[PDB]
Each structure stands twice: as C-alpha cells, then as structure tokens.
C-alpha cells in the first residue's frame, strides 16, 4: 500500500477468501529479495514516472497487467516494473536497478507474459512455443495434444507443424479402415484449444493442402472447418518456381513420400523430383494450388507465408537439423523436434526513446550509442529469462537450455520516422532502418559474446555458421552497412563463442506498444485516427501549429479513414510524412523489410496491406518478397 515492500507483503500474504487457500502472488525467491533489500528497493522507485503513460496507455496496464487483489488494483505501475526487474534479475540488485530505470523511462519493455508473471511463483515469462508433432500415430498425436494442452494452460501462443501426419485415404495397419487425414485431427486440436491461439505449419506438397488453407473460411460446410487455428504455409522454393513456370505440382502423403520436411534446397528438390518420377503422388497444375492460396488469403488473410529454404539456409541453427515451422506471428525461426519444443524469449526496444534534439533549434539526431547500449541490456535480460523461466513442459526446458535463442525487437519505427520528419519511403528512412537494425544486431551479438566469456558458449555452438565466423548478413552475401566494427566482433565470436544461438526477431507488439504510447512495431500507421476517438499526436501537433485544426478536420479525418492526402489545406510535406499504410507501396514495405532482414537472425512479422486487391497484384507481391530472399513473405493480408 503506497510502498513497494508493503505491496509485495500484500501480494505475498494474499489468501483466496472464497476457499481458505493461501494464494501467494509473489515467489518466495523474489519475496525474500525484496525483504532483504527493502530500503534500496523502496527509495529507487520514482513515482513521478507514472504520468508518462497516455490515458489509454496507462488504462491498458490497469485493465490487464497490474496485479489485483479482490478485483481491486494492488500494484502501481512502478511496482509492476520493479517486480519485473527483480523477477528477471534475482539477487543482482544493480542489474535490477538498471532494468527498472530504463523500463520506467521507456527505453524498452518485455513481452506480456514477462509483465504478467515475472516475480510470481510460476514465472512463465516466455511469449510462445514451437511444437513438433511427435509421430504419425495415435500415440504420437495424443502425446502432442497433451503437450499443447499443458502449454496452452499457461496461455502463450503455439506454432504446430504437422507435415508428417498422413493424408485422407492413407493406408493403416491391421484394419480395413483408411485414414481420415489432417482436417479431423486439426479439429481435435481446435477443441483442445477452446477447452484450456494456434498456428499450424504445412508444406504445400501435402495432399490435404486444399482443405488446410481453407481452415478459416466463412462458408463453413460444418465438419471440414476449424476456427481460431491459423494455417501457415511452409513453402519450399520448388513450389514458387513451378508456380511461375506454370508447371506441375505433386501432392504426397508423407508415408508414400517420406523425408520431404527433413531436407531443404537442393537435397529437397532431388528427393521431391525423384518422388514425382517414381509416381508416388498425384500431380496437378501448380497454379490450381496457387489460385486457391490467393483466394483464401483475400477472404481470410491466411494462410501466412513463410519460406522454408530462406529460413533454413540462413539460420545459425542449421547445425541442429532442419527447421520445420515458424511461430504464431511468423517471426521466430527455431529448431523443434519431438523432444525439443522451441521457446520465444521476447522483448522490444523503444525506437523513439533515442531521438535527441541538440544544441540548436530544429535539429534532431538519433543516438545510436544509447541504442547499442540498451540493446546490450535487453540481451542480458533475455538470457536471465531463459534461466529463470518456468517451463510448462520438459521439451521446452530442453530446447531453451541447449541453444539459448533470444528474440529482440522494436516498436515505434513509424513514430521515429515521423518525429524525425522522415517519410516512411524517404531515402533517409531507408537508411535509418538499416542503421537501427545494424546497431541492434551488433549490440546483441557483442553482449551475447561477453556472456559466452563468463558462462561459456551455448552447448550447441561448435559447428554453427557463427562458429565459422559466418554471421547473418554473410548468409545474405552482403557487406554490413559499417556503422559498427564487425571484424572485431566476428574475431571475438570465433574465439569465445556467443551465449545465444539466435538473438533478433522483431515481432507483433500489440498491448506492450499500447502501454508505452507507440505504433505497432515496425509497420507504419494504419490510420491517423484510432477510434472515444484520438488523432495521431504528431499529425495533431502539426494541425494545431497551422491553426487549421478547425472542425473541418476532426470530422473529415474520421470519415476519410484518417487519411490526409487530398485535404485541400495541408502542406505537401505533411502529406508525405503521414501516409497511411494503404498509401505506401507494398513495394517499399518489402524493400525495407529486405534491408533490415540481413540483420535479423530469425525473421519478422511482415503484415501486408492491399488497396484494390487483384489476384495478379497479390501474385506479384508474393514473388517480389520471395525473390528478395525474405523468410516471412507474409504474416496477415489486410485488404479492401
């Protein structure tokens, strides 16, 4: 009660009245720490920093993040932050004190599940899991389902790959019965989801593919659907080629054509090709599937598209074996197997916090030194999270301890551009994009190398691209932009290793960018009006500064989507600076994505926006991304 240790006492001592069970909401561990250090901890909190969140930003904390006692809010926002700092840092009080300040000052934040659970008795701080279907058998299928149920119990998303499950009509031993396929098994996972979100990963040569991409269709002929599951395609290059050559494409059942999902690139093309020649599947025209994809995406925004070969060929985890899927948001690309469930350890840097208006009037700069610095901090945090996390299933524990993948991201890209008066499609924006990501990658790699010196390289380092001094941009065959000194980094890496197999994967930010008052991660603004009803504060400030914020605006703006193009009284520079995402060529979007990608270890959630969507425009948009070498060609398609 207005004092951190007292708040901790309360949450710690809490008893569920309606039942008589003591229900501690702090772990023993963090309780004792707060107690053994109450003074330092109590007097470090700056309560002034609570009115630094917007109305609707602070009300997202209150609505859902601040711990509550009897439906009444138990935590002030700084208590939350301080709680998280400790949950992350344990006995490391100086580290915790640093994390507290930087979060409270809004330099970065941590994913929702960290915010919810850090400090509490079963601290599941990890943002999502990637699950391998354990085996094409009732035992295998029910063992997986159990595992998802256990996982889906402490919430957090699941990315499930099912390339190895046989398709409708496939043969089954000891019975006259024929297999029913994927759809009815999807249905089982649907029902388990609803009982306790899901992405499903499939390679497009799977014989149940036509039905699988229609998982989210509206005209639901009862039994063949399955909703709040999201289908994602794990596309090999061969598919895209057949589609552009207008050639054939063969559907197989994994039992007649085994191994397809356990090789990529040329080994996959030989194995695939050899299976076509051997008459093991059913050939159709590549474009019949292509057309069904596009049709499904136009109506439902799914399936997502993640390029299998790009992902595997350019992954520092390639020494592990072949990577069979991404995650629910299409940013994580990490190895998974029957006994290794990959985990997403996520945090995001607040890009705008590094803008500085220096000795002058209107000059702004970007403090890349502070950026590098903070990303070193967040790298250290995400390591602790790996160690201090609660693992809902053993598979997850094995995966994280063994390869230690980390997942850094960003938010307030669009804000940064705007504050610095840079159109999203300016050459300056193009350049800032590159430098921002160069410095984050460089920082996290540097910090991760330091850790390898103290605690050793992750178990699985020897034999990896990084161990051979092949870093991410090398696998893109590009020279780094050169703001940072990569030689020295790479030399140290080869000497000492790094602690983390992977480190970058800019994700969706949803409610954690809301609290901080910034825009969805790295996409631009969808509108200059969200909803109540509030206008883009930068656009707002400029319309006041010109006096034109007369009612011929607040009204206009809402009945125009929040667009400013073709307003009669607004300078062209403002027009260029406040384009809606519907007004930015998806071509620029993809280019900037391709630019930043040589600095992304993993992938990123690349939402795509089309105005007057034709099947042809979509097709060019997929191929464009494809040929740019992107791992994630598309997360959702938003349209109309």
């Amino acid at each position: 009660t207005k004092q951190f240790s007292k708040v901790v006492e309360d949450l710690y001592r809490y008893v569920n009245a309606a039942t008589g069970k003591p229900a501690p909401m702090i772990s023993d561990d963090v309780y004792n720490i707060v107690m053994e250090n109450k003074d330092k901890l109590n007097s470090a909190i700056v309560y002034d920093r609570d009115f630094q969140y917007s109305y609707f930003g602070f009300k997202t904390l209150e609505r859902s993040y601040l711990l509550r006692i009897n439906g009444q809010v138990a935590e002030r926002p700084q208590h939350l932050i301080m709680r998280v700092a400790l949950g992350i840092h344990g006995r490391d009080i100086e580290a915790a004190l640093e994390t507290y300040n930087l979060m409270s000052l809004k330099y970065f934040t941590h994913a929702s599940p960290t915010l919810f659970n850090a400090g509490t008795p079963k601290p599941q701080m990890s943002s999502c899991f990637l699950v391998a279907m354990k085996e094409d058998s009732i035992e295998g299928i029910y063992d997986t389902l159990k595992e998802c149920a256990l996982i889906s119990k402490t919430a957090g998303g699941i990315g499930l790959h099912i390339h190895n499950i046989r398709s409708t009509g496939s043969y089954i031993a000891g019975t006259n019965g024929t297999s029913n396929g994927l759809i009815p098994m999807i249905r089982v996972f649907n029902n388990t989801a609803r009982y306790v979100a899901f992405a499903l990963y499939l390679e497009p040569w799977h014989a149940d593919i036509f039905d699988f991409i229609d998982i989210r269709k509206n005209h639901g002929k009862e039994e063949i659907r399955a909703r709040d599951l999201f289908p994602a395609l794990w596309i090999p290059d061969l598919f895209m080629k057949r589609v552009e050559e207008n050639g054939t494409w063969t559907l197989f059942s994994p039992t007649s054509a085994p191994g397809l999902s356990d090789c990529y690139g040329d080994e996959f093309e030989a194995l695939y090709t050899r299976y076509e020649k051997e008459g093991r599947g059913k050939t159709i025209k590549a474009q019949k599937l292509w057309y069904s994809i596009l049709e499904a995406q136009t109506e439902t925004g799914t399936p997502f598209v993640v390029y299998k070969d790009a992902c595997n060929r350019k992954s520092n985890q390639k020494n592990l074996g072949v990577i069979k899927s991404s995650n629910l948001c299409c940013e994580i690309v990490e190895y998974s197997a029957p006994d290794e469930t990959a985990v997403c350890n996520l945090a995001s840097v607040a890009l705008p916090a590094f803008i500085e208006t220096s000795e002058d009037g209107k000059t702004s700069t970007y403090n890349f030194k502070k950026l590098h610095e903070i990303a070193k901090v967040v790298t250290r945090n995400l390591n602790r999270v790996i160690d201090r996390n609660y693992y809902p299933v053993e598979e997850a524990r094995k995966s994280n301890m063994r390869h230690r993948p980390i997942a850094l991201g960003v938010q307030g890209l669009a804000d940064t551009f705007m504050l610095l008066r840079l159109p999203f499609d300016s050459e300056e924006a193009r350049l800032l994009n590159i430098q921002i990501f160069e410095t984050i990658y460089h920082a996290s790699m540097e910090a991760s190398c330091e850790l390898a010196q103290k605690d050793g390289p992750y178990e699985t380092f020897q034999g990896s691209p990084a161990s051979q001094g092949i870093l991410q941009f090398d696998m893109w065959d590009q020279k780094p932009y050169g703001m940072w000194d990569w030689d020295t980094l790479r030399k140290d890496i080869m000497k000492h290793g790094v602690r983390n197999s992977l480190t970058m994967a800019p994700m969706p930010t949803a409610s954690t960018s809301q609290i901080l008052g910034y825009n969805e991660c790295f996409e631009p603004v969808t509108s200059n009006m969200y909803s109540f009803q509030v206008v883009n504060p930068y656009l707002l400030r400029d319309l006041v500064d010109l006096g034109i914020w007369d009612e011929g605006m607040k009204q206009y703006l809402i009945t125009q989507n929040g667009s400013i193009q073709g307003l009669p009284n607004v300078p062209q520079e403002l027009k260029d600076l406040y384009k809606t995402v519907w007004e930015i060529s998806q071509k620029t979007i993809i280019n900037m994505a391709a630019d930043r990608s040589v600095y992304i270890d993993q992938s990123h959630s690349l939402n795509l926006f089309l105005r007057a969507p034709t099947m042809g425009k979509l097709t060019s948009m997929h191929f464009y991304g494809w040929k740019k070498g992107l791992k994630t060609g598309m997360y959702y398609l938003r349209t109309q």
Binding site: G616, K617, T619, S620, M621, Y624
Partner: peptide, 6 residues
C-alpha cells in the same frame, strides 16, 4: 497473374 502495381 503478375500486376506489378502494388
């Protein structure tokens, strides 16, 4: 099929 105006 291939409209490059996106």
């Amino acid at each position: 099929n291939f409209d490059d105006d996106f």
